[PDB]
Structure formats: structure tokens, C-alpha cells
């Protein structure tokens, strides 16, 4: 479809002009003019970056190979990254004066939960992660342990049942305390005079803070809920004395619900498989519908978005709490092009740029309640928070916040509109986090540690360095600790407390429940006012971190320190001189080759981004891009430095490709590698990620992935 200087193909083309226009007050001759334009006026820049990025890396790989046995001098390295622009200077201090958020964002300390957007199931699930039942997240893993006579069944098991009911109780007396007496004590709840009253066996109470009382369902002689609030967090009682759950409670509990994920950001990046005008408006597709508020997904049942939970006011009004996470998109980093829009000479459109565009416009519909638009607003305040990863630097920032402003023309929306959710998951971000933080002072809604892309960083842009350590280690070195420390202090000094989110990085381990409530509370307690989760269950047991940690104050407490200096970020995790035993090293190809192949097989076969792969100690590993980036990028290094032959790696993924067919037998869809490891376009392109991976710029996996899924593709339609 001919349009200006443009080949955009019909199924976009469809899509933009029925589906996504229609409503936005946008002329559709004249968007597909903005479009032409703002392509076409930003193309130079996103190549002249990203040209950029491999010189630095030429010159970073020239000085490490010209520099061997004896090790590295750093005030050197510092001077040479300088010299080449690479660590730019350090700005003046300032404050960000980015307005129009809203209070989930600017305010809120709680989890931040992330979905693939090609997926409308989990999609849905995800906004609706807003509200979670606690019963279900620890009756359903293995935070009330299976071990004791308590195992799960088909059957409900009141041994389980009763470890659950008094774990929460437990909580409601760490969080909402009772002025007297504990909950575990409750015989029923009741309003009197607007305040909260408990009965318990010898007295009745209200709460050692009546401003914890948010609210209550039902008549108030007798509630059929009761909503409380703690560090800015609601909790909710379901009362329902001919429960399953309810008969066996002293107060007829049915559950305990909390608000979990305050936001959710629909991703479009690593963790789904676009790589077509089909793929892309399919996600394009169930975005809209989330800001329209009308998608659906079919399970006897419908999956919609949840309504606004009304109730009644402590003193006997109605009001409203929303019943929805507020959504986030993430857009595409100004990495790739995409078929879906092509030059006349058939150079592809960066994917970025469309990205801004169509994403933004489609959000429009999620900022007003109309026919049109549809019924749920997204953002009460009239912003588009979109997530920008992968960026390399302020320069790179600077032209994300350029692009923005350009779709926002196009779009006729008010300048700094599209807000951006800033990853500090590149070296070059890291080490100029404040220049980053400037370049974006009036849009910027958060900052987060992408550990995962950012360990990816660290292997390849050292990759002339030597041997790296094994994977396992990365999380103790100096370069890593500095980082997430570094952060927090750069977010703080920019006045991010009340204005923008702090954020960490993602729990992996979607078995590990147990481990995630003891472990991930140290995030909170670093200061991170938001941090990343695997799944509305996990985001319903991080809630109740944000219970116990009080955020707000750690931040207060925390302002003005500097834990980490330039020579701590700069830090290379070498293996200098540690000989890893012949079994250990046999160990990380084995592990690493697994994790590929049971990551790629799914991906370029069956065009799903992220999936459950179990490790060679079969702990379940949520993994994605970045998580491939680290696998891959370690092989690489140490293929690069001869700690493995080439021929070392082609045994491991023979002997780990039919295991991974073995875990992924049940599967009707799936078609295993072996034996004919050679006719497999899956196996080739795990191989190539290795095999080619110092050679990928800034050891970015989407060109194998996604030229190797457009040939799987092709070989199944002819
Ligand atoms: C890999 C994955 C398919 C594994 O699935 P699984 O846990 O083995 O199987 P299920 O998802 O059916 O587990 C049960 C429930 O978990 C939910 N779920 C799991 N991850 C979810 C996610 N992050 N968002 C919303 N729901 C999720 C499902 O909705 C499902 O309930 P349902 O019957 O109502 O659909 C899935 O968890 C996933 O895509 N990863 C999480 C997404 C993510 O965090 N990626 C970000 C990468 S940066
Ligand atoms: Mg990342």
C-alpha cells in the first residue's frame, strides 16, 4: 500500500485505519503524512546512534587486545573511555519536573508486574493483577510448605487450609494492628460510629490506627468486607461465613485480598516473538483493546477487564478504587527494523520509530471514557507511559525524548504526554545514569536496573578482556553491586521520591516462592519503590514486602549518600586466575546449552518469547532476550579465550537438545531437534548465538531470532 515514500503493509495498514483511528481525532491522510515525515526526519540519527555504538566497541575490543598477561591499568581505561566519548562527563545536579503522572507511579510503592502483550490471556490477567487473593497465592505455592501432612490435592485440605488462614492472620497483625488482641482471635467484624470494631472473645477493639480503616462492603451491622490501607496499599477481608474457606475461620474469613501489581507494563520487547507485519499488529491488536477496555479472552468463560471496586466510606459514602493495574507499554529499543513498513528500495523502517507511533496512538483510547474509545481509562491524569529499553547512553535518550515529541505533533496530543520508563540496563547508561536522567527531566517516569540485559552489557562490551566468571557468580561482583546502588542514589538526587519510580529487576525463579518472600524484600529495603515479578501470584506475595518495608522512609533515609564510585561501575568480572576443575566447566556449557536450546526451540519453532526452562538443577527459569543475551554472550567469551573449543560447544547442545525434546514431549505443537540436528532451523539458530555471538552488535540476539524465525515461517507455509 503506497503511501508517500512508504510500503506499508495491509495488514498494518487495515488495522491503523479501522481498528486504531477511528476516534483519536486524528485525519488518517494526515497521520500517514506525520508518519512519512517523522520516519523519514529521524532515520539518519537512529543509524548515526547505532553506528556509533559498534565503533565504541571496535575501539573498547581494540585496547583490551593490545593489552594482554598484564592486568588492566585502570585510570588507562578510564582516560580511553573518555577519550572516545564513551564515559561522558557528569552533569550538574538538578530535579526532574516531569508532571501529569499518576499517584500509582509518582507515589505508590508496590510491585510492577510485566506480560507479554501477543498474549491476551495472560495480557488480561496482568491489569487485573491490580487485586489478588493471598489465599490463593499460598495455598497454590510453596510459601506454606507442602511437608507436615499439608499437601496439595484435587481436594481442599483444611491442614493447608488453616497454615494459610493463620499466616495471613499473621500478616493483618504485622500490618493493621489491633489496638488490643490479635486477628487470629476475631470472631466477626462490624462498623460502629465510622470506625472499624473486631469482636474478639473477651473484648471488642478497633485498629491501633483508625485512619487503617479505608472502607467496608455489605451492610455495616455485618460486612461482607472490609477494606483497610497500610503504606498506601489496600488490603482487603472477604467475610462469607458458608465459604468452603469460611465455615472453618473464628471470624468466617473467606480470603484476604491485596492489591498487588499497582502497574504492569504490556511488553512488546523480550518477552515476545514479533517479527512481521502480522505478529506485530496481533500485539498492536490486544493493546488497543486494553486501552479500549473491551478485550476478551476465551477460556464456559469469559476473561474481561475488571471494573472499579466500589465501597463504603468509613463515615457511610460511596467511592471508588480502580480495579485495574495502570499499563505501561514497552516499546522496541532503536535496535531493529521490521518488515512491516518498508523504503521504496526495500530497506525496512526501524521498529522503534513505529513502535512510538502506533503504540501512542493507540493510547489515546486508554485516556478517555467514550463510544469511540471505549469504555476504561487507563491513565486518570492524561499521560502515555511507555518503556524504552536498551538505550546506550543520554544522546540516545535525548532522541527517544526527540521521537516522542515528534509523535506527539503527529498525534495532536500535548507536548510530554508520552512519558518514558527509563532501563539502566547498558554499560553507557550505567556509567552516565545522571546524563540519561537529564536528557529525559521533563518526561521520565522511572528508572530500573535491568540486571539481566545489563550482565549481557558487561560480557560483550569486555568481551576482549579474558574469561569472564560462570554465570551463577555475576550477582556478587563489584560491577553489579555498584550498579543497583548506583541507581538508587542517581533516581534520589534527581527527586524521584513523590515524582518517579525507583525500579528493580525481575524474580526468575517462578517455582521459588518461598524463596522470593525471603529474598526479593531486600529491594524495598535498598529503596526500589517498584520491582519487577513473574506473575500476578508473585505479585500478590511481593505485596506484602511494600507491608513490612516502608519505602518512602528508606528513600528519606537514603538521599544525599554515594555508594559507588566510577572505578567499582567499571569493574570487569573477570575469572583472573581461577581454574574452574574440568567438571565445572562441562557444568556451564551443559547448563548454559540448555537453557539456549530449551529457550530457542519454543522461540523460533512456535513463535513464543518467553517460556518456563528448567536448569541443569532443574530449578524453572523464566526465560527471555536478555536472559538469552547473558547464555549466549558467556559461551562466546569463553569460546573467544579457548576455555571451550568450538567443537566443545557442538557436543553439549547435541547432548542437551534431546533432553529439552524430552521435557517439551507433552506438547502437541512442539517438533523435537533430535536426531537430525542439522535440518533444524531451532538447533541452527542456538548454535548461531554461540557460535556468531562476539560477533552480534552489543550481543543483541533479535537478528538470528528473528531472521531465523521469518525462515521457519517461510518453511511452513511452503
Ligand atoms: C513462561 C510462562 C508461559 C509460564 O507459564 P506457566 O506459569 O508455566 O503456566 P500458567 O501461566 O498457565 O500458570 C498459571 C497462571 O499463571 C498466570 N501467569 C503466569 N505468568 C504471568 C504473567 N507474567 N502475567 C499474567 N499472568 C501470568 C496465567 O495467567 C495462568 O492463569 P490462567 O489460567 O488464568 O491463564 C509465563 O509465566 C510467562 O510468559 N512468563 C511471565 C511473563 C514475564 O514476566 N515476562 C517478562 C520478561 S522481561
Ligand atoms: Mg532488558
Not at 75 to 95: C, H, K, N, S, V
Not at 381 to 404: D, N, Q, R
Not at 578 to 595: F, H
Request: charged share 20%.
Amino acid at each position: 500500500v503506497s503511501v508517500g515514500n512508504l510500503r506499508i503493509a495491509r495488514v498494518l495498514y487495515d488495522f491503523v485505519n479501522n481498528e486504531a483511528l477511528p476516534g483519536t481525532d486524528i485525519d488518517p491522510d494526515s497521520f500517514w503524512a506525520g508518519v512519512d515525515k517523522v520516519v523519514a526526519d529521524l532515520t539518519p540519527q537512529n543509524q548515526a546512534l547505532l553506528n556509533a555504538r559498534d565503533e565504541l566497541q571496535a575501539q573498547i575490543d581494540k585496547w583490551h587486545r593490545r593489552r594482554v598477561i598484564e592486568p588492566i591499568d585502570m585510570d588507562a581505561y578510564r582516560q580511553f573511555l573518555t577519550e572516545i566519548g564513551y564515559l561522558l562527563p557528569e552533569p550538574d545536579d538538578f530535579t526532574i519536573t516531569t508532571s501529569g503522572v499518576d499517584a500509582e507511579i509518582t507515589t505508590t510503592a508496590g510491585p510492577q508486574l510485566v506480560v507479554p502483550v501477543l498474549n491476551a490471556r495472560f495480557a488480561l490477567n496482568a491489569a487485573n493483577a491490580r487485586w489478588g487473593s493471598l489465599y490463593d497465592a499460598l495455598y497454590g505455592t510453596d510459601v506454606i510448605p507442602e511437608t507436615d501432612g499439608a499437601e496439595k490435592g484435587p481436594t481442599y485440605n483444611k491442614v493447608r487450609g488453616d497454615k494459610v488462614i493463620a499466616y495471613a492472620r499473621k500478616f493483618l497483625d504485622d500490618s493493621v494492628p489491633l489496638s488490643s488482641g490479635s486477628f487470629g482471635d476475631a470472631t466477626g467484624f462490624t462498623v460502629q460510629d465510622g470506625q472499624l470494631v473486631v469482636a474478639l472473645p473477651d473484648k471488642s477493639t478497633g485498629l491501633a490506627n483508625p485512619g487503617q480503616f479505608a472502607g467496608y462492603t455489605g451492610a455495616a451491622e455485618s460486612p461482607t468486607s472490609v477494606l483497610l490501607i497500610n503504606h498506601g496499599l489496600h488490603i482487603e477481608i472477604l467475610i462469607d461465613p458458608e465459604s468452603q474457606v469460611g465455615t472453618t475461620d473464628r471470624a468466617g474469613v473467606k480470603d484476604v485480598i491485596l492489591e498487588s501489581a499497582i502497574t504492569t507494563i504490556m511488553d512488546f520487547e523480550d518477552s515476545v516473538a514479533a517479527v512481521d507485519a502480522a505478529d506485530k499488529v496481533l500485539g498492536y491488536r490486544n493493546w488497543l483493546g486494553l486501552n479500549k477496555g473491551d478485550l476478551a479472552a476465551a477460556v464456559a468463560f469469559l476473561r474481561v477487564l475488571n471494573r472499579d471496586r466500589n465501597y463504603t466510606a468509613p463515615g457511610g459514602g460511596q467511592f471508588t478504587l480502580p480495579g485495574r493495574s495502570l499499563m505501561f507499554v514497552r516499546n522496541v529499543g532503536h535496535l531493529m527494523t521490521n518488515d512491516a513498513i518498508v523504503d521504496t528500495d526495500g530497506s525496512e523502517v526501524f521498529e522503534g520509530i513505529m513502535d512510538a507511533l502506533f503504540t501512542g496512538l493507540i493510547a489515546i483510547h486508554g485516556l478517555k471514557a467514550s463510544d469511540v474509545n471505549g469504555p476504561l481509562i487507563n491513565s486518570r491524569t492524561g499521560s502515555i507511559y511507555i518503556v524504552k529499553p536498551k538505550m546506550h547512553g543520554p544522546a540516545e535518550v535525548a532522541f527517544t525524548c526527540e521521537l516522542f515529541s515528534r509523535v506527539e505533533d503527529v498525534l495532536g496530543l500535548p507536548q510530554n504526554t508520552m512519558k518514558i520508563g527509563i532501563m539502566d540496563e547498558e554499560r553507557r547508561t550505567t556509567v552516565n545514569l545522571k546524563a540519561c536522567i537529564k536528557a529525559a527531566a521533563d518526561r521520565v517516569v522511572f528508572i530500573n536496573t535491568g540486571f539481566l540485559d545489563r550482565t549481557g552489557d558487561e560480557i560483550h562490551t569486555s568481551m576482549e578482556a579474558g574469561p569472564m566468571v560462570r554465570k551463577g557468580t555475576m550477582k556478587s561482583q563489584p560491577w553489579i553491586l555498584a550498579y543497583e546502588d548506583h541507581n538508587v542514589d542517581a533516581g534520589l538526587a534527581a527527586g524521584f521520591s513523590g515524582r518517579a519510580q525507583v525500579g528493580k529487576g525481575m524474580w526468575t525463579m517462578t517455582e521459588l516462592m518461598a524463596d522470593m518472600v525471603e529474598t526479593k524484600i531486600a529491594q524495598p529495603r535498598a529503596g526500589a519503590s517498584t520491582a519487577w515479578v513473574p506473575s500476578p501470584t508473585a505479585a500478590t506475595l511481593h505485596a506484602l514486602h511494600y507491608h513490612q518495608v516502608d519505602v518512602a522512609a528508606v528513600q528519606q533515609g537514603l538521599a544525599g549518600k554515594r555508594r559507588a564510585t566510577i572505578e567499582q561501575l567499571l569493574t570487569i568480572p573477570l575469572a583472573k586466575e581461577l581454574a574452574w576443575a574440568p567438571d565445572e566447566i562441562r557444568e556451564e556449557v551443559d547448563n548454559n546449552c540448555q537453557s539456549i536450546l530449551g529457550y530457542v526451540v519454543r522461540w523460533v519453532d512456535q513463535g513464543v518469547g518467553c517460556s518456563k526452562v528448567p536448569d541443569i538443577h532443574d530449578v524453572a527459569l523464566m526465560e527471555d532476550r536478555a536472559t538469552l543475551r547473558i547464555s549466549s554472550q558467556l559461551l562466546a567469551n569463553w569460546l573467544r579465550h579457548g576455555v571451550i573449543t568450538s567443537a566443545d560447544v557442538r557436543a553439549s547442545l547435541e547432548r542437551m537438545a534431546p533432553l529439552v525434546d524430552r521435557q517439551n514431549a507433552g506438547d502437541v505443537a512442539y517438533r523435537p531437534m533430535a536426531p537430525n540436528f542439522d535440518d533444524s532451523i531451532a538447533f541452527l539458530a542456538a548454535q548461531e548465538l554461540i557460535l556468531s555471538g562476539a560477533q552480534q552488535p552489543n550481543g543483541y540476539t533479535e537478528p538470528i531470532l528473528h531472521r531465523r524465525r521469518r525462515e521457519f515461517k517461510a518453511r511452513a507455509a511452503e
